[PDB]
Structures are given as C-alpha cells and as structure tokens.
Design a protein around this ligand. Structure first.
Ligand SMILES: [C]C1=C([C])[C]=C2C(=[C]1)N([C][C]([O])[C]([O])[C]([O])[C]OP([O])(=O)OP([O])(=O)O[C][C]1O[C](N3[C]=NC4=C3N=[C]N=C4[N])[C]([O])[C]1[O])C1=NC(=O)[N]C(=O)C1=N2C(=O)[C][C]C1=[C][C]=C([N]C(=O)C2=[C][C]=[C][C]=[C]2)[C]=[C]1
Lengths: 133, 666
C-alpha cells in the first residue's frame, strides 16, 4: 500500500526518471544547478540585508522623548479648548491623538467636548476642512 | 507444527487439506464427503510420521496397517492405496534404507538416465527400487555433478553445493539421518572489512544494511503497486529497478535542500522588506525630532498655536516611535526564526562514497544468492519461491556433501566417462548414443524404453548443442531453455596450517573497491574442521575471473586477507583450488535463476516430458518417451540440492505410473 517509510516514490517521478537513458541524470543536474542558484541568491540578500542593517546602527536612542506622568482633569481651560480645536483641524477624528496632544483629557472627555462645544467651535467647518486634504 | 501435523508440514503438505495430485488420484475421496476426507488425511499424515520417525528401514504396507487404529485401520483398501501412493512418489521410502523384501528377481522395462547428479540418482534409486532395469550415463569420472567436494589429506571442502537451507520442510533433513553427513550450524553474524582493511563501525553496518533492506522492499512496491514491469518493450530487471529507486532517492534528497533554502530566502527577503521599511523610518524620526526640537527652542511665553506646534510634534513623534519599536519587535522574531532554519539542514547526501560501496557488498551478496548480475534477475519473479522457504538454521556438510551423492551412488549401474551425444526417441522406443570421454572415437549405443534427462540447463543451452535430440525438441521447450536464467558462481579454497581468523566466526566479508567488482572475493567462509577458508567470486566478477590464472587469484586472496589480519599473520597456502563452473563443459554454469521475462511457469515447462510422433501414421497416440529432471525443472525449489532431489523423485513417480501402471487409482 505505502512504500517503506522514508523511501520516496511517486508514479509521477518514476516515469520522469525513465523517459530515456539519461533523463536519469538530467533531472539531477537540473536540480544541482537550481540549488547552486538559490545558494548564490541567498548570499546576495544576506549581504544586501547586512549593509541595510548597518544604516540602522544607533536605533533611535538619540530621538526618544521623556515620559508624561499626569492626571486627567475634568475642567477645560480656555487654553485647553484651544489646543483642542487645532487638534481637530489637524487630525479629524483620531480622538486618541487629540488626547495625547491636549495631554490631560481622557479619550472620551474629548468626544463629549465634540458635542457641548460643537455649538460654538463650528466643529463641522473644522471637520470638513480636514477632509479637504 | 508436531505430532501427525508435523509430519505433513515436514513432508511439505497441508495437514488438513488434500493436495491437487492427491485429488488426481483419489477422485473418489475428494469428490467424496467431509468425513471420508478427514480419515484419508489422517491415514496419510500418520503413515508419513511413520516413515519419518525412522527412515533407515523400508516401511511396508503391513507395518503400516499394523500401527493404525479404527476408525482408520478399518478400511484396508484405503490404507493400501494411500501407502501405495506415497511409496510411489518417493514421499516415503526414498533414498537410503534397508529393504525388508529383497529385490524382485526379474525386472520390468528398461530406462537410460542421463547424468548421475542428485536428481539423476535419487531418481535411479526410485526407479530400481520399483524394480526396473535402470542405467545412468555420466560424462564425468565421478558421481555428484554439481556436488563436488574436494579431498586431499584432512583437507576437505566443497567446490559445489554447501549449505543445507534449514531442515523444517527438507527432504534433506531425512537424508541426513539416513546418511552420515555431519551437519554444523552457521552463525549469522558477518563482519565487514572495507577495501583498506578495517571494520565497518557498528554504526554503518546497521545504517547501510537497513537501507539495503528498505531498498528491495522498495523495488517490490515498485513492481506490485505501480506495476513497473516493462520498459519500452524489454522487461524491467531487478538491477534497473534498484537504480531507479536509488535515483529517486537522491532526487528527493535534493528536492529537500532546494525547498529548505527556498524557505530561508522567502524569509530573508521578508526581512529586506522590513529593514527598508525600518530605515526609512529612522528617517522621518530623525528629521521630525529636529522639527520638534526647533519648535521647543522658541521660549515662552507663546501664543497657543506655537504651543500646539510643540504638542503636535510631540505626539506625531511618540506615535512614530511606537511604530519603530513594534517594527524592531517583528525584527527579533524573524532574526531567530532564521538560525532556526539554518540550524537544521536536510542531509546533504543520500549516500556517501563509503556507504554506497558497502551497499555494493549487500548487492554482491544478492548477486551470489542468485548466481547472477541483478541486471539479469526478473523484477517480478526473482523471489517467486519466497514462501517455500524451509525453517531453522542453515547448515554445512562438515565432511563434504559428496558423501550424499556417493551414498545414493551405491548399487546402481553407472557408466562413468560416458558422454551422451545423441538422444533418439521414437514411438517404439529410445536409442541413446554416447562416447568414451577418454578415447572419444570409441562409440556406444543404448536401447531403452524411456530416457530421463538431468543434463543441467547450461548443457541444454549449449549452442551448437553438445547433445543432439532426434527428432529436435518441441520449440515450446527449446524456447523455455532459452527464456530461462542459467547463472554462475565460483569458489576459492585456501588450505593453511593455522586458524588465523577469529574462529567463532563463520563468514566475514571484504567490501570491494568498485561497483564493477563488488563480486570479486567479497566473502569468506570459515566452516570446516581443518584450517580452511572459502572464497566467493559472485556477481558479474565470476565470469571474468574464470580467465585469470590460479596464482593471481590466490594473489588477490592473500592480499585481501593480509589487509584484514596483518601482513604476516597469513602464511602462504599449502593447498589451493579454484572452481571454474561456467567453463565446465558438463555444467556450463552453476545453477538457474529466473531471468527477466521468464517465470515460474518456465520450470513447469522444463518438467513436461516429450511424446514422440506415431511411426506408421494414424497409429494411436504414443506413450511419452523422454522425461526431464534436474534442479531447473522444479518450479518450487529451483537450483538447490533438495530441489534436484525432489525433481528426480517426481520424475520417478511419473515414469513408474507410466511403464508399470498405477494400480492404486481404482
Ligand atoms: C555450483 C554451485 C555452487 C558453487 C554452490 C551451490 C550450488 C551450486 N547449489 C546448487 C546445487 O549444486 C544444484 O542445485 C544441484 O547439484 C544440481 O544437481 P542436478 O540438477 O542433478 O544436476 P547436476 O548436479 O548438474 O548433475 C548433472 C549431471 O549431468 C552429467 N552430464 C552432463 N552432461 C552430460 C552428462 N552426462 C553424459 N553426457 C553429457 N553430455 C554431469 O556430469 C552431471 O553428472 C546448492 N544447492 C544447495 O542445496 N545448497 C547450496 O548451498 C548450493 N550452493 C550454494 O552455496 C548456494 C546455492 C543456494 C542457496 C540458497 C538457495 N535458495 C534458498 O534456499 C531460498 C530462496 C528463497 C527463499 C528461501 C530460501 C538456492 C541456492
């Protein structure tokens, strides 16, 4: 039913190695090369990836920024409303970013604001102006 | 199996069923009902056991009935029939026994037997046991044919046959008791010595052999499941199919590598894509740090939009650093997931040049098992008889097989140095022409009623032929003589003055240099009492070595041995011989194998006798006048001593039934 375990024979491959006298060694050279040609290929992209990696030496440690420990206040200062509006204009709806920016207002206080003040900060204009970009 | 049932099995018959040649003979019982069958079986089995349980004395009809009970001993015309049958087809009272009732004064009907090898003789016994006038014709100065045993001093070894292939089933088991051949076992364990002269480590010996086995098993699958049996008109040899399986093995070894690397790349190259992505981010990040830095240098106080600019760029920055961290992330994963794949390669080779050369010894074994180049064995039917295999340890005839031919030989009219030239068979009888091998211008005619021919395959094949038949042989038959494999095997006998080998070791093998010579001296036999070694010329090698002189052969013989044991643990040999079978004009080969595009059937065909044409035309269908046995006629046990013996039993049944009638079928 099945060939000795680990021995390999498919009907397909059998007819292959018997199509002539040296269809035999044909298929075996053909692969010997086909392999060489994948070894050479492998060097190349190792090399390529090597330099490509050097260029990253340093990581981003020059560019990291200190942490921001601080407490989500409930009141908006006029100062605060103001960064808001601009955050909206710059960002649209990414309520997350907009919260990062203002610094001390939670991702929701943000959305609420979007409505109490929608009133008077013409949040519609602001928002459509954003889309137009 | 034992008791009554043992004796069936030991006799090569199913203990609870009726053989076909039984039915041929007891049509009444077999067409009969169950009850009668079971009786008949039992009668046969027991009688068998009887002749078994002691084979040095004729077992008579009486003696038999004697030991039976009712129900069974009741019908005395079964019993007499049953006993009569066996007795007829040497199933009991074969070989060397003592007759209770000396031989019937006068004889019915003459037979010439051609050639006094086992078959030949084991037949002539039966025939003259059945009191016919029997005479063997034999070209040699000696009996045995391909049972030669060599005798000088206390040096004693077999050029010809040598193993007794188990006893459980074996006619030879019986003949061992009848005659004093001294049987020593054979110890499986064979160690190996690479061309250099060194042990193959337990490591390899195992691996390579285990591969070998896996390999054949594979050729089998090939033939049965994928039906790989013709290749552009020629029929696949075992060779061929082995190559094919090795190739495909090499093949899949490559495919493995290829697809391994092809999965390193696909991952290396998924890395490229990630580095670029990552470099071009160190970009925006650097550049954006700048922007933020600048924006923060603008000291307070500020208007809100400039404040925002800081905060914005702050966000846009951390938000961007997230990314390069979560991409640094992904980078680690893929960097390890890659020593990983470089750590566990596939094997770089299927078979080393050391290996693939040992494996070449295992082939040379097989080549010897079959007295032939696996290039010649039929793929389908090479192990056709792999079920009719005896049981228990193979053995050796420590005093030299010839002892058996010479046992049978005895009290038997045998003309030696008589070479049969023509065999003429007509409707009114055969005449056989022979010469004296010594002075060959000196000629003999023998008249007889039948002619039983043991001429080994080889001679039959000889072309022009040595023996002429008159009239020519039915093509159905000559065709089968062609179709069929006559192989070859030779021996080297090394006679020393001291046991320099490990003596608790019966055989050890030398691994040869090439493929083209794996045969050449590839195996050595320590079997005997004296200090004597057996050297085997197997496979393709044998045919060629027949052309090298003796000296040279003993040359490479010493050579190899030294190499294994020390360049001066190895004396010169006192006595030596070399077998040149294929050259032997009365053997032209060692012994049949199933060629490619032959089969079992062809053996059957060899066994079939020849019935001449009618003298005067439209006179009635004649009697068969010309019969065949020899190791090549026995489809089920070919090319062995048992086989030849069995062969010549069978033909003697058949000729007796013929010329003396089978009064036991009524
Ligand atoms: C050669 C050889 C060797 C080297 C080895 C061996 C052998 C061989 N074998 C075999 C035997 O030998 C045989 O078979 C026999 O012997 C045969 O016999 P026959 O048939 O009878 O015949 P012969 O013998 O030949 O005789 C013949 C005769 O004839 C005459 N002639 C001829 N011509 C003529 C004449 N005459 C007149 N005129 C004319 N022209 C001659 O001369 C002669 O006489 C063997 N066997 C056995 O048994 N054993 C052994 O061991 C052997 N060997 C070896 O070694 C091996 C083999 C084998 C093994 C194994 C087998 N199988 C088995 O077993 C099996 C398989 C499968 C499964 C299971 C098992 C086989 C084989």
């Amino acid at each position: 039913r099945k060939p000795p375990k680990g021995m390999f024979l498919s009907q397909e491959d059998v007819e292959a190695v018997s199509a002539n006298a040296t269809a035999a060694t044909t298929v075996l050279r053909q692969l010997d090369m086909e392999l060489v040609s994948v070894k050479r290929q492998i060097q190349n992209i190792k090399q390529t990836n090597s330099a490509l990696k050097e260029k990253l030496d340093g990581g981003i440690e020059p560019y990291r920024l200190p942490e921001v420990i601080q407490k989500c206040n409930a009141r908006w200062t006029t100062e605060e409303q103001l960064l808001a509006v601009q955050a909206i204009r710059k960002y649209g709806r990414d309520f997350q970013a907009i919260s990062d920016v203002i610094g001390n207002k939670s991702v929701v206080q943000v959305k609420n604001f979007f409505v109490n003040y929608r009133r008077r900060f013409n949040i519609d204009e602001v928002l459509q102006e954003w889309e137009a970009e | 199996p034992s008791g009554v049932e043992g004796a069936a099995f030991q006799s090569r018959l199913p203990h609870d069923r009726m053989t076909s040649q039984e039915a041929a003979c007891f049509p009444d019982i077999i067409s009969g009902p169950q009850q009668t069958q079971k009786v008949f079986l039992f009668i046969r089995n027991r009688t068998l056991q009887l002749w078994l349980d002691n084979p040095k004395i004729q077992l008579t009809f009486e003696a038999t009935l004697q030991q039976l009970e009712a129900p069974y001993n009741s019908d005395t015309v079964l019993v007499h029939r049953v006993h009569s049958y066996l007795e007829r087809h040497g199933l009991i009272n074969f070989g060397i026994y003592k007759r209770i009732k000396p031989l019937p004064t006068k004889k019915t009907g003459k037979v010439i037997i051609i050639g006094s090898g086992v078959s030949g003789l084991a037949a002539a016994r039966q025939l003259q046991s059945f009191g016919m006038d029997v005479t063997l014709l034999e070209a040699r100065d000696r009996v045995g044919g391909r049972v030669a045993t060599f005798r000088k001093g206390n040096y004693v070894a077999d050029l010809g046959a040598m193993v007794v292939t188990g006893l459980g089933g074996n006619p030879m088991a019986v003949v061992s008791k009848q005659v004093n051949m001294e049987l020593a076992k054979i110890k499986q364990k064979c160690p190996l010595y690479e061309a250099n002269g060194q042990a193959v480590p337990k490591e390899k010996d195992e691996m390579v052999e285990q591969e070998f086995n896996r390999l054949l098993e594979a050729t089998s699958y090939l033939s049965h499941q994928l039906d790989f049996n013709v290749l552009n008109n020629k029929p696949v040899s075992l060779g061929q199919a082995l190559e094919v399986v090795i190739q495909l093995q090499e093949k899949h070894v490559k495919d493995e590598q290829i697809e391994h690397w092809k999965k390193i790349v696909k991952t290396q190259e998924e890395l490229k894509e990630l580095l670029n992505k990552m470099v071009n981010l160190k970009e925006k990040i650097k550049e954006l740090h700048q922007q933020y830095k600048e924006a923060s240098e603008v000291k307070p106080p500020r208007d809100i939009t400039a404040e925002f600019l800081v905060k914005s760029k702050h966000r846009d920055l951390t938000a961007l650093c997230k990314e390069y961290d979560e991409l640094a992330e992904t980078q680690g994963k893929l960097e390890e997931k890659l020593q990983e794949l470089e750590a566990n390669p596939p094997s770089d080779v299927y078979l080393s040049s050391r290996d693939r050369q040992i494996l070449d010894w295992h082939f040379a074994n097989l080549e010897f098992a079959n007295a032939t180049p696996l290039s010649t064995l039929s793929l389908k039917h090479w192990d056709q008889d792999d079920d009719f295999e005896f049981t228990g340890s193979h053995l050796t005839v420590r005093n030299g097989y010839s002892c058996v031919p010479v046992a049978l030989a005895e009290g038997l009219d045998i003309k030696l140095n008589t070479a049969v030239r023509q065999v003429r068979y007509t409707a009114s009888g055969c005449e056989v022409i022979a010469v004296n091998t010594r002075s060959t211008s000196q000629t003999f005619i023998y008249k007889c009623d039948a002619v039983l021919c043991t001429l080994p395959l080889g001679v039959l094949k000889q072309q022009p032929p040595a023996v002429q038949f008159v009239p020519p042989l039915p093509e159905w038959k000559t065709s089968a003589v062609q179709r069929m494999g006559f192989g070859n095997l030779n021996k080297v006998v090394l006679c020393f003055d001291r046991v320099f080998w490990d003596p608790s070791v019966n055989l050890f093998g030398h691994v040869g240099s090439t493929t083209a010579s794996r045969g050449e001296l590839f195996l050595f036999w320590n079997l005997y009492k004296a200090p004597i070694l057996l050297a085997l010329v197997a496979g393709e090698a044998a045919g060629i070595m027949e052309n090298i002189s003796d000296d040279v052969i003993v040359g490479r013989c010493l050579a190899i041995l030294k190499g294994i044991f020390g360049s001066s643990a190895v004396p010169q040999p006192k006595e030596t011989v070399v077998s040149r079978w294929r050259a032997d004009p009365w053997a032209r080969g060692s012994y049949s194998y199933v060629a490619a595009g032959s089969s079992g059937n062809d053996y059957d065909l060899m066994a079939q006798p020849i019935t001449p044409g009618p003298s005067i035309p439209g006179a009635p269908q004649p009697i068969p006048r010309l019969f065949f046995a020899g190791e090549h006629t026995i489809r089920n046990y070919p090319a062995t001593v048992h086989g030849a013996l069995l062969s010549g039993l069978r033909e003697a049944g058949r000729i007796a039934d013929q010329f003396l009638g089978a009064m036991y079928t009524l």
